[PDB]
Amino acid sequence: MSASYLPSILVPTVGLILPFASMAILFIAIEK
């Protein structure tokens, strides 16, 4: 399979940028 060559090497930011983005988006929403 992919092992350590396809998607698991880009996960590091995927599992963490959406939390940062979600807190930012919801904070911009409540700031409106």
Partner: peptide
Amino acid sequence: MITDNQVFVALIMALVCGYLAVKLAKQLA
């Protein structure tokens, strides 16, 4: 210096937020 497509996705997300405000301004279209 990693994930160039992710950088473009973050940039287009910010642009989509700005276009969302523009869509609010357009309204009727």
